[PDB]
Every structure is written in C-alpha cells, then in structure tokens.
Amino acid sequence: MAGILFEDIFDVKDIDPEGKKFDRVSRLHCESESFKMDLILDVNIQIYPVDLGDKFRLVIASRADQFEYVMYGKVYRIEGDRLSAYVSYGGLLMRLQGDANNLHGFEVDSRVYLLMKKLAF
Amino acid sequence: MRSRVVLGEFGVRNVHTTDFPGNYSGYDDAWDQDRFEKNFRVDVVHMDENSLEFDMVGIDAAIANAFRRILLAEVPTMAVEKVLVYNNTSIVQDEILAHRLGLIPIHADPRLFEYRNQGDEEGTEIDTLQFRLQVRCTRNPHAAKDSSDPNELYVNHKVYTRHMTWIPLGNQADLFPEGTIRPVHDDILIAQLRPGQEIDLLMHCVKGIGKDHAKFSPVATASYRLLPDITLLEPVEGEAAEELSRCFSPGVIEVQEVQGKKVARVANPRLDTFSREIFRNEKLKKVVRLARVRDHYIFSVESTGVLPPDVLVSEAIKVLMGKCRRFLD
Amino acid sequence: MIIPVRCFTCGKIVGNKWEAYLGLLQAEYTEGDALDALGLKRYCCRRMLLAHVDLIEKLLNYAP
Amino acid sequence: IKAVFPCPSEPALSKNELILTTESIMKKSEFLCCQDSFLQEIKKFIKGVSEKIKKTRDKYGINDNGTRVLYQLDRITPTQVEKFLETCRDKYMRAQMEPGSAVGALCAQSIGE
Amino acid sequence: GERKTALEMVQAAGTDRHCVTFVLHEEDHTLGNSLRYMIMKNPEVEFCGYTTTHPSESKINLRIQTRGTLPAVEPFQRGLNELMNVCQHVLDKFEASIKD
Amino acid sequence: MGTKANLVTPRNGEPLIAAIQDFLTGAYLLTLKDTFFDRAKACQIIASILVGKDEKIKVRLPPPTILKPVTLWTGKQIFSVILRPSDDNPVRANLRTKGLCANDSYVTIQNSELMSGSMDKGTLGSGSKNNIFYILLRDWGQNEAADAMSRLARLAPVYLSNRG
C-alpha cells in the first residue's frame, strides 16, 4: 500500500499540550534530520519521551506495520512564501514543508491519502 | 486501556466498551461462550428479604443495562389497574385514592395469570384478583377522657392496607387464597377518615407491564455501579494515611502502621460512593488514580414485596430470552 | 395532601412511614436521624417526607 | 470550482495567455447574453477586469513561486474558468428581478422591523 | 413467528443484501442494544446501526449492513442465537449461585 | 414560500433557519480535535444518514482514520457524513484568532469532508456567508440544504445524550 516515497529519520522540537485536552492531541514540531524539513504532526501522544518523542522514521505512503495514521479525504496545497502542503486527517493536520528533492505522493485530492509511521528501529 | 475506566477531575475517559472485533488491533474475541462462560460468574451479596446484591463478572455494558431496563419496567407483576366505586363518602377522592390504591403492591405471583383482553368486566375469569375495601370510621363511644388524640376518640380513623379484604372469584378460591393474597404491607395511610364517612370499593387487579404505567414495577433499586478499583503509585506512607482515609469513604483505605509508615493500601474498594475530594488536596491527587473497572457490574436489586428479588432477576433474565428468541425464526 | 406512596423518582414505598415519625419525633431524634432509622438512604424519600405537608389533619379538622 | 477538479492540465505555456483566450471565449459566450437585460453588460466589463486581475495574480504566482509538483499545478485550467463563467452567468441572470418581482412590501418591512 | 415484525428493506440494494433494515416492531433499547452489541461483534458486519427513529419507542430500525458478500439475515440470526446462548448460560451460572 | 422563504430573507440576506442551541455545542464537541470515536460508534451516525424517512441509502463508512495499536474514528468526518447524491463545498473564518493557533477558525471544508476547524454559530448557524446554506444552497441548489440540516438535527443532539 506504499507508493510512498518518503524514507526519513527524525527528532523533535517543542510540545504545546495546553492546546487540546487530549494530551494525546499535541502539536509535534519535528524538523527533518534527513535534510531539514519540518512536520507539524498531531500524534495521539503515548510513548514519545524526548521533548517531543523519539525516532519518527516516517514513511509517508499511499514491516510489522507499526505505522499508523491515515485519512482518505481532502487537502490544501499552498506554494508558500517553500512549496508546502496541509495533510489533514479530519482533525490531525500535518504541514509538510520543503523542496522538490523529495519524491512524489501528491494530488489536490490526494495528499490526505497518506500513511505514517513510528519506531521500528 | 481496554476496560479500565478513568475518573479524571473533569470528566470520565474510556467509556464506550471499545472492544469489538475490528475496533482494536490487539485481539477482539469473536464473542461467545468458551471465552465468556469461563470468565463469567455471579457472586452473591447479602441475599436478604427485599434487597439483593451481586457482582456479575465478565459481561459488557449492553447486556447488563438490558437487565436493568427489564427489571424496572419490562417485567410484569400484580397491581391494580381499575377501581370500582361504591359509596365513596370520604375526603379527596376518585383519582388520588384510585391511584393511591393503584400504587399498593398486591402480593400474588405474576406467573399464574395472563393478560386481559376485552371481556365481560373487560374480563372477570382468570386475572381479576378482586379486593374489597369496606372501611368505616365513627366515634369511639367510651371516651370520658374527652378532647383527646384522634387515635382515641375515633375508630379506624385511617384506612390502612390491612382493611383490603379479598373477594373470591370461584376460579382462585382454592389455589392461592390461603393467606398469600393480601397486599405486602398492612400499613399505608391511604386516606384518613373522620366520623360519619365510609369507603367501599372493588379493585380490579389486572396484569400489566411496567411500560404501561410504572405502578407495575416490582423493583426499586434497578441502577448500579461498575466497581471501583482505586490504585496507588509509590504511596504516601506515614501520616498522610489520615488524608487518604478521610478523602475516600470511611472503610475504603486502611490505616495500619506508623513505624512501617505504610499508608495502608486498599481495604474495601467497593464501599466508596465517590465523594471524590481527592482531587482537591492538590498534593495527593497526583498519586492516587481512580478506576471503576468494566468487568464487575455490581448489581443491587430490591423489590416491592411482590416477589423475592431472586424471582425478579430470574424473571428478567428469562424475559430477555423470550424477547431474543421471539425474533429468531 | 396525603403522603405519596412512592418516591416519585426512586420506587420505594413511603405511605407506611408517616405514623412512625410522629412517634419518632417524640423520641426526639433529629429529623435527619428519624429518617435513618427507617430506611431512607437516598435523596428521594428524604424529600418525600421532610418536604411534605400533612394537610390531612388540618383539612379534616372541619370536613363535614 | 476548486472542489470539482478537472485534473488534466499543467503549467507549460504560462496559461496567463490561455486565460486570456478563455477571456475571449468569455467575451463571446455572454454576448449571446441578452434578454430582459441591462443586468449583464453593465457588469460584463468588470467581470472581464476581474478575470484579468486573476490572470495577473496567476502570472505573478507562476513566475515567482516557480522561480516537482508544478507548484500544485497552480490548478487553474480552461475547464475550470469556463465552468466559472457559466456559474457567473447563471447567478447573474438568476438574481434578476423584474420580471417578477414584488419589491415593495419587502423593502417596507425591511425598513420597518 | 416474526411475520409482522421483521420488515426487511432491501430495495436499491447496492450489494445484494446491503440496506437491510430490520424494522423491529414493538421494541425498545433493551433488546435493541443487546442485539446491536452481539451483531456488531462479528468480523463481517460494519453496522449494528440500532437507532429508534420514531418519537415513540416501538420501531428500532436496526440497519445492519454487512461487508457485501453475505446476506444480513445470517448475522441477525447469529446474534440473536448468540444472545440466546449468552443469557441462558448467564442464568445457568446465576441461579446455581443462589446456593451461596 | 415553503422552500425558498425559510432559508433566505430579502430584509437581511441572512439565514433564519439555524442550529438554535445545543446542536451548535453538540456538533462543536464532535468537531473538537479531542473527540475520538469507535466503529462501535456508527450508532449515532445512523440517526442522520441511515435514518428516518427519505435518507436510507447506505453510507460509505469513512475510512478507519487511525491504524495504530488502536484504530479510531476522528470526530470530524463523523460530522461530515452523508452518502447519497455526493456534492462539494468550501468554507473558512470561524470565531477565533489567526497565526496554526489551536485552530478554531478557517475551517476550510472541502468537497463534503472536514479538513480543519471546529464549528460555531458563524460556521454552523445563522451567519452571513459561511454556513451549511450559502455553501449548500448555492452549489448545490435547494433540496440539499433542507436535508443536511436534518442529518444534523438527528446526528448532533443525540450525541450530547452520550456526553452530557
């Protein structure tokens, strides 16, 4: 189910858990330790212990399948001013922001049609 | 997680019974007996005359509430549905007295009668336990101690449910009426009477179901708890025992030692009707965690004299059988 | 006017329990403890006795 | 027209000129306007100016932002703008009172209550 | 004997047995949600769907909607028979505990 | 004056029909980023689009929008649910501030899903230009506004009775 083509490693910057009463709804800010790219995840926080977690080897797709979130709906795709998306999950946004060095995966109905990932690592 | 409810200071989490096959990636029980008749069991608590209590272990919320809702008003019992009128001289009348009597629990088993279709008196053959109520009040004639209590100048100044003499329809005369036909209570204040008044009635004790008009409920306590399982984390051993024995209900947490500081952990985590002060010590609430568990839907049924509570709970659990296999052909 | 035989929101039978308080208000417990020696361990029946007005007596004072 | 996506198109020719060609088919497609009228010519040129400024904004975006997902393709297609102008004509010609129209009492109570 | 109760409603059935709304007549939440429970507990159903649509609680239009292949009578009866077995085994373990 | 009188007034240009009350807060609470649901909570779905007269088509079961150790249904596309006569929409600008600021504004509905946001009287009630009317009265026509209001009227306020 993986026309992905992300293959990342990650760490994290800052929680903001005073936002949502589910602490398991909290704004991840993780910037790519593949190149630099940042990702505003909204993980159902359980076992992320560093200032916002652990390895986030996100493989953002279309392996023991620890890899969790998918919505199958509708997107928004600005150009940024830094081409940028907004990968919503009907309530769990994820603003991928970067360059064209990353591979494909996009459509403006399909950049919600996306897998995600956690540790297997 | 998976049947551990949680009682945060603000709202209750973990409450939907979220274990259905394909709503959890652990494993969910394509559910029946072998996994269910091994985990199931029904303890018993105190058994007694009109109050019963027990702790089913292994149901989930739907069948348990099905019991509750069936015990309340989806089980039939014997109670008046009509009142014939003869010389109702008394004070306030004709719809309260009618309904007062409508609310008196008669004590005939509701498994030796049938429903009532449109018959002779609307029907007079099997169902009509017919009760005669002939109460007369007058002046106690030897009261030289003039100007005294009503209890001493009158005669049956009130109308208790001990004047409800039974009338025989030749049907019943030999099976029930040896003494197991009177109303449960021989003391209910139905209507006070002052000299010169009488009452005379006829009391058509139809069958009925609680949905009709809830005066057919046999039960009073059909509503219950889950079961609390209040934890502790690296306890507050010492004098804090005073706090974590006045926060929780008076028997819940022991207070054992001082040298072995030992804020004495859980003693009876089922006696606590959740006052929940413990979130307002502001230095303890981050030690205790409150958890009513989803297995033991502790029941406590009490009747209204019509039937022993065992008969009522058995009747309810069998009326669910009737409903379930009345749509299964 | 008279005592509700049932606690409007509980189910428990009540009318059996008014000629005990008028005999347990003269053993002179506190009302809150005349209504613990007879069974009422909830809101409901505590309302249904503490709150009720026995107009029965005063009305019947001149009934005819 | 964002929400109904006619996928086939892409930025190759700097569609600003293609947007002007669609403005031309626009200029033709509501000069068949006319009926009970005086409700479309008065705003037809301001319509044209509005799509012209849309094309100018698209030009700025396709120049600077693209200076590869084709910058989201910067969706705009001939099909979308044709549907856009058809919807514009539909609502402009639908909101037409007289014929009709019973305008009086509506204004009376509008100023009243 | 369910002639005037189980008024099934496959009319524009996308899958052959799709919009299978057993309009259970003379019914409440009591059986309704218990059935709903047992039905929903089979890995071939997607709706247990129980929702009393009327103001008056008599017609619980349980709109079971299986995964397309099966009918919906098959789950319906699996669930009803499973609730039979469950409640009868509950009574068996229960009334043999009154001897405590 | 039965289908065009109700929702659109010439005196103000603002809808009269609107979630009067708790529909507003019930639907809001649905939309709240917290609420995570169950496939077992397809129950409350079914007073809306698997429901009373004139709505019993199927519903496409919005996909399992988590596949963790714990699969779960977010609270939004449980609101954004109907599966007869598919449509398209758009919105923005709810009653909150600007910048991703714990977002309760610029809801940004796309074609009948619910991307971001959380409703309000100005995004689910008698607002002006963002509604379930001026996005579902104009495009797409009548007869699809008087039948998303009903799926709300039976979807949301029979959620509160499970939350309080």
Side-chain angles (χ1 to χ4, degrees), chain E residues 9 18 21 36 40 45-47 49-51 53 63 65 67, chain F residues 39-43 46-47 52 56 58-59 61:
Chain E
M9 293 177 71
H18 200 80
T21 69
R36 178 270 175 194
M40 193 47 247
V45 181
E46 280 170 28
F47 288 168
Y50 157 75
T51 81
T53 192
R63 183 177 176 88
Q65 300 200 168
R67 282 190 173 168
Chain F
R39 167 172 73 124
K41 304 292 106 166
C43 201
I46 286 189
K56 295 183 289 294
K58 50 172 210 173
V59 71
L61 189 64

Side-chain angles (χ1 to χ4, degrees), chain E residues 9-71:
Chain E
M9 293 177 71
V10 294
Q11 315 282 59
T15 77
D16 180 59
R17 294 330 300 271
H18 200 80
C19 61
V20 193
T21 69
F22 311 136
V23 181
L24 300 177
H25 291 349
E26 271 72 8
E27 198 67 27
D28 291 331
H29 297 277
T30 66
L31 178 45
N33 196 304
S34 304
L35 194 41
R36 178 270 175 194
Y37 178 58
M38 299 316 308
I39 297 174
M40 193 47 247
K41 293 176 72 68
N42 275 324
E44 291 86 4
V45 181
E46 280 170 28
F47 288 168
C48 48
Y50 157 75
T51 81
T52 81
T53 192
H54 295 105
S56 87
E57 267 164 357
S58 289
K59 318 206 178 275
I60 65 150
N61 307 334
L62 185 150
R63 183 177 176 88
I64 178 172
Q65 300 200 168
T66 184
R67 282 190 173 168
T69 76
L70 298 175

